[PDB]
């Protein structure tokens, strides 16, 4: 219905705003664009589902997220990919990991404070009916 489409449009607005706030944080610059295969040809041999904040915005605009839980699976993916691709104890890798975990924690905290649980439940129920 038109009312369900209004719901999903509100979800997209909410998700763009959360993603913008993550994308402008200096700590998360390394997650703002895809890892460049021209610069890191090894990356795809390890990471099978690349994800980044630009790709998240593209997915929002493509109507790929019908719930915040589905959005969070992709934030979880940006984080898990960084932990998997950069696991060693050297400081450069520790720093990327810390930042990946901060990105995840920040997204979850913003959502905890700003997502109405009944709004999410409504989204989930509409998605389940399709």
């Amino acid at each position: 219905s038109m009312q369900e489409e209004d719901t999903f449009r509100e979800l997209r607005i909410f998700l763009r705003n959360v993603t913008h706030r993550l994308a402008i944080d200096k700590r998360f610059r390394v997650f703002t664009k895809p890892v460049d295969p021209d610069e890191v040809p090894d990356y795809v041999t390890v990471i099978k589902q690349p994800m980044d904040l630009s790709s998240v915005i593209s997915k929002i605009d493509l109507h790929k997220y019908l719930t915040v839980k589905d959005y969070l699976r992709d934030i979880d993916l940006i984080c898990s990919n960084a932990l998997e691709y950069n696991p060693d104890r050297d400081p450069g890798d520790r720093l990327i990991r810390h930042r990946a975990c901060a990105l995840r924690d920040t997204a979850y905290a913003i959502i905890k404070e700003e997502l109405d649980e009944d709004f999410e439940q409504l989204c989930e129920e509409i998605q389940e009916s399709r």
Binding site: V40, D42, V46, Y85, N86, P87, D88, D90, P91, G92, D93, R94, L95, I96
Partner: peptide, 5 residues
Amino acid sequence: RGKGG
């Protein structure tokens, strides 16, 4: 694997 350093 790894970008750091």
